[PDB]
Amino acid sequence: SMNPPPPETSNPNKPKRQTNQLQYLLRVVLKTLWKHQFAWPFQQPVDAVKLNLPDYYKIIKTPMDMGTIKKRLENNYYWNAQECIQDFNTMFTNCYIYNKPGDDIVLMAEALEKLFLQKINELPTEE
Ligand SMILES: Cc1cc(-c2cc(NS(C)(=O)=O)ccc2Oc2ccccc2)n2cc[nH]c(=O)c12
């Protein structure tokens, strides 16, 4: 039943970078989805005790979520955009493995992934 610790949002060993895309992912792409109607389940780590889902973390092994993704951006945790983009693909994949096609939660995940995949069709350029 228990909840594991959340993903790390800071890491001193890990090198950090503030590219102009990561700035965009936080200032534009992440606040675009954060405000959406379907955003709330993905706004913090899943609570398998509260949800009474004791099997969730026996099937999901790389948990991810936007709460976690948001702070990583704020901590400059990533080295480049694709690192963060891949925290998103993990999140959505976790939602489509643990649940079934058509379940309410995946319909939101699919809604988001498609507003997602549309906002990162155009990142800003480098310096
Ligand atoms: C990714 C995700 C998020 C949630 C979920 C999270 C919270 N809040 S919290 C504090 O983050 O854990 C509350 C209800 C939730 O279940 C919903 C199931 C259907 C429609 C709306 C919500 N779930 C539940 C089951 N499977 C999942 O993959 C999942």
Curated annotation (Swiss-Prot):
Boundaries of every Bromo domain copy = 17-123
Source organism: Homo sapiens (Human)
Q: Where is this cross-link: Glycyl lysine isopeptide (Lys-Gly) (interchain with G-Cter in SUMO2)?
A: K58
Q: Which domain of life is it from?
A: Eukaryota
As recorded in Swiss-Prot or TrEMBL, the protein's gene is named: BRD4
Family membership? Belongs to the BET family.
Q: Which disease is it linked to?
A: Cornelia de Lange syndrome 6: A form of Cornelia de Lange syndrome, a clinically heterogeneous developmental disorder associated with malformations affecting multiple systems. It is characterized by facial dysmorphisms, abnormal hands and feet, growth delay, cognitive retardation, hirsutism, gastroesophageal dysfunction and cardiac, ophthalmologic and genitourinary anomalies. CDLS6 inheritance is autosomal dominant. A chromosomal aberration involving BRD4 is found in a rare, aggressive, and lethal carcinoma arising in midline organs of young people. Translocation t(15;19)(q14;p13) with NUTM1 which produces a BRD4-NUTM1 fusion protein.
Q: Its function?
A: Chromatin reader protein that recognizes and binds acetylated histones and plays a key role in transmission of epigenetic memory across cell divisions and transcription regulation. Remains associated with acetylated chromatin throughout the entire cell cycle and provides epigenetic memory for postmitotic G1 gene transcription by preserving acetylated chromatin status and maintaining high-order chromatin structure. During interphase, plays a key role in regulating the transcription of signal-inducible genes by associating with the P-TEFb complex and recruiting it to promoters.
Protein name (record): Bromodomain-containing protein 4
Tell me the impact of changing D104G.
Found in a patient with a neurodevelopmental syndrome; uncertain significance
Q: In which tissues is it expressed?
A: Ubiquitously expressed.
